[PDB]
Ligand binder design. Structure first.
Ligand code: HEM
Ligand code: HEM
Ligand SMILES: CNCCN(C)c1cc(F)cc(CCc2cc(C)cc(N)n2)c1
Ligand SMILES: CNCCN(C)c1cc(F)cc(CCc2cc(C)cc(N)n2)c1
Ligand SMILES: C[C@H](O)[C@H](O)[C@H]1CNc2nc(N)[nH]c(=O)c2N1
Ligand SMILES: C[C@H](O)[C@H](O)[C@H]1CNc2nc(N)[nH]c(=O)c2N1
Ligand SMILES: [Zn+2]
Lengths: 411, 407
């Protein structure tokens, strides 16, 4: 069965056959749509189909489907599962897997870049100090003095679920938040809980508005340990505005390297619970969400006040006005310092091109509209007008519980 | 199967029980979400009637009463007999208000119960439809102090005698192709406009000509009527800061009034049920004015503002967008024509959603449509999880009549 999607701005219709390869479920039924819900130990049994299906895809992509090399590899993984109950990926398969999990990531607007991903294999890693070393090398390599490069670092896979590698940080670089006794928050409210764990674990917190958090690293199911990323490895951009000279006096900066460290990468049924990956920012992630969400830095009022907008009624659009100026400021600061960044016009347009190309070459492109459409100026971007089909392909990135919720402490 | 929704901005969690009364299907399955797709006999009729009368008599606390039973009884008699049935006024009104209450794409539902319902089931000809429509327009406009209304024409019978308003809205601007190959007026109406020309409208060929109504009674061929111009309240668009704004020559109409939808109540279908409320400013300033396939004035505005249009990354589009939208709200406000901004309207929808959770056990909502087309994440609805599902009574899409009308 074929499925059509239409662009209501251009009238282009595409046809999706790829959804036919979909495995995991959506959360939706014929009776309820769960499309705006934020979040909607494995045996030998389930594992062989999952391996087989992955290796069939791998071998197709390399035009070697059904070859002797293909059959020997199935054969080999098969024996390895039965006798050891898991199996090891070849390097080539890990690389292909990691790229595909990004390619398959339906909430990711930046997927046009999926095939240029630097894969760092850290499956020989055994300790938290070794993890720190790997993560430093990833940061320096991805940062590349501002000319950002996509990378991912892959730590050993889950075995019995009692020996998991985890990066406790949600991103490798992120600012501390501190709840004050008066109930206000200093720094980033989104990281208060994690900041507190760090403090409990022994971090001496500077207690400023922009303190880079220590890495908190768990190897092999052991208690996690703290490490401070060398500051010279943390590229930051002071935020100023091309026309408003008081803008710099707001005291804003952000880091250059967006690097998600809390997701789980699934490849042929194997689970990589620590697999930090990084790209570069779209400007609105910082300018709209990080700065202007109410539950984040929330600078809208102070910006609008300095701009002396009429703030007595919402229908002045003072919020919307301050919002644009802040986003101009973020993109200007990053460009001026030569740190890679993309605005939401350029990103979404590239994404529409990527998506059409995917339909032509691949039979589809799973996409989550709720997430792809940017958080300002929705309908003046070509994705707002694009119908999308959301389904789940593997390899994939998945959510996993926060480790402080599940970790069995040793002491 | 008892479902939670969370607001990620405020941590408020609501439990939804109402979805377990979902009738119709979503287009979604466990394998594929179709959340972003624009459009995904005697036997049938009696359950539909019963399910409807059950909620009605429940709403007035006479569930299981003699009057409830008698009524189910009577409607049963009438279906077996006449193969259809007729709503009591009281049912009709409850039905219409509930179709709006159930509209998962409508951000404006906090108003749902203050809807003035005009019963036009006695209407028989197109002139009659024109009269009813003019009264609806004048009533809802109310010299700028707008009031919600719907006017309900007779229900479908054998589908050969449908009433339909051919216009998509009661009030819209015409659309014409040039030798130029560009488009004069509103490109979204080019086709309807030529049906008007080809049915005989003398078009003035301007940028903002209010189209005529094309009314179809009892399955006959539709007829043209012009709305008395004095009933069409329009607003010249100026900016409170930019004096040149006014010379763009923009105006819009005060009355948003959708006329192409099918209203379904207890199985019965009202194929002509024009309804109206008042605009949220982004509809005109973001969609009408800035969509590429609409009036698409972003470029001209940014030019007048002398923004750097060299690089997408100056955000000149975003800048001109805010200004266009400030000007819509300002103009409507200045002329005292009811309008709501996206901040105000979404904040009110969150309040409604909470009332519905508390008093009804849920509120079907379509996030894709509820979040405004600008400044999404600065409105509280962006951070609100919504469950989308289909309750009846409902408004439904229906095929454009020119594709269906045997002339
Ligand atoms: C190259 C630059 C990239 C850009 C501009 C980009 C853009 C984005 C943005 C804006 C989001 C939504 C973020 C949010 O609002 O929370 C996102 C989601 C995501 N991206 Fe990217 N992305 C990039 C690279 C990558 C890379 C390298 C990967 C993995 C290798 C990746 C995988 C994902 C995934 C898995 C999600 C969804 C996360 C979830 O479900 O929460 N992206 N992308
Ligand atoms: C009081 C002012 C109202 C406001 C501000 C309002 C707001 C909106 C908006 C912004 C939309 C989406 C429209 C679009 O983007 O094309 C919408 C959809 C809708 N509203 Fe309203 N609404 C109002 C009154 C009404 C009334 C009176 C009814 C019916 C009695 C109604 C039923 C609907 C329906 C059925 C839809 C979605 C139709 C579709 O699937 O396209 N609304 N509402
Ligand atoms: C609940 N979701 C919030 C945290 N999270 C799990 C997350 C995951 C991503 F893959 C991506 C992001 C966004 C950060 C990011 C990550 C990358 C790799 C590129 C880019 N431009 N931005 C967040
Ligand atoms: C692409 N959209 C499909 C067009 N369409 C059928 C439509 C239906 C509505 F209920 C409402 C609207 C929007 C117009 C409107 C209608 C009403 C009644 C109030 C209001 N503020 N705005 C369109
Ligand atoms: C409730 C809702 O799904 C949630 O706010 C989503 C909406 N869309 C999003 N889109 C992006 N890219 N990132 C987000 O965090 C969210 N949050
Ligand atoms: C493809 C997508 O479903 C389509 O563009 C939708 C998006 N959200 C919308 N939201 C509203 N309120 N009105 C619309 O016309 C649309 N269009
Ligand atoms: Zn869905």
């Amino acid at each position: 069965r074929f499925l059509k999607v239409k662009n209501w701005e251009t009238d282009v219709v595409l046809t999706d056959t790829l959804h036919l390869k979909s495995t995991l479920e959506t959360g939706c039924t014929e009776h309820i749509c769960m499309g705006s819900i934020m979040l909607p130990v494995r045996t030998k049994d389930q594992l062989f189909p999952l391996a087989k299906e992955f290796l069939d895809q791998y071998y197709s992509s390399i035009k070697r489907f059904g070859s002797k090399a293909h059959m020997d590899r199935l054969e080999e993984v098969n024996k390895e599962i039965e006798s050891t109950s898991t199996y090891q990926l070849k390097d080539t398969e890990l690389i292909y897997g990691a790229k595909h999990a990004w390619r398959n990531a339906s909430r990711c607007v930046g997927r046009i870049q999926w095939s240029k991903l630097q894969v760092f294999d850290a499956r020989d890693c055994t300790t938290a100090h070794g993890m720190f070393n790997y993560i430093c090398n990833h940061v320096k390599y991805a940062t590349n003095k501002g000319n950002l490069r996509s990378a991912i670092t892959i730590f050993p896979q889950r075995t019995d679920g009692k020996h998991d590698f985890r990066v406790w940080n949600s991103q490798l670089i992120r600012y501390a938040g501190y709840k004050q006794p008066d109930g206000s928050t200093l720094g980033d409210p989104a990281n208060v809980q994690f900041t507190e764990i760090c403090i409990q674990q022994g971090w001496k917190a500077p207690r400023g508005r922009f303190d880079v958090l220590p890495l908190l690293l768990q190897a092999n199911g052991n208690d996690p340990e703290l490490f401070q990323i060398p500051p010279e490895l943390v590229l930051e951009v002071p935020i100023r505005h091309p026309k408003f000279d008081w803008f710099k006096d707001l005291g804003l900066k952000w880091y250059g390297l967006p690097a998600v460290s809390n997701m789980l990468l699934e490849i042929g049924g194997l689970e990589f619970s620590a697999c930090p990956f990084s790209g570069w920012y779209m400007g609105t992630e910082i300018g709209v969400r990080d700065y202007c969400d109410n539950s984040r830095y929330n600078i809208l009022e102070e910006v609008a006040k300095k701009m002396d907008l009429d703030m007595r009624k919402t229908s002045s659009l003072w919020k919307d006005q301050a919002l644009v100026e802040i986003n101009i400021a973020v993109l200007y600061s990053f460009q001026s310092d030569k740190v890679t960044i993309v605005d939401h016009h350029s990103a979404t347009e590239s994404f529409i091109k990527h998506m059409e190309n995917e339909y032509r070459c691949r039979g589809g492109c799973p996409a989550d509209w709720v997430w792809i459409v940017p958080p300002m100026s929705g309908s003046i971007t070509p994705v707002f007008h694009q119908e999308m089909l959301n389904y789940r392909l593997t390899p994939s990135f998945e959510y996993q519980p926060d480790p402080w919720n599940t970790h069995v402490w040793k002491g």
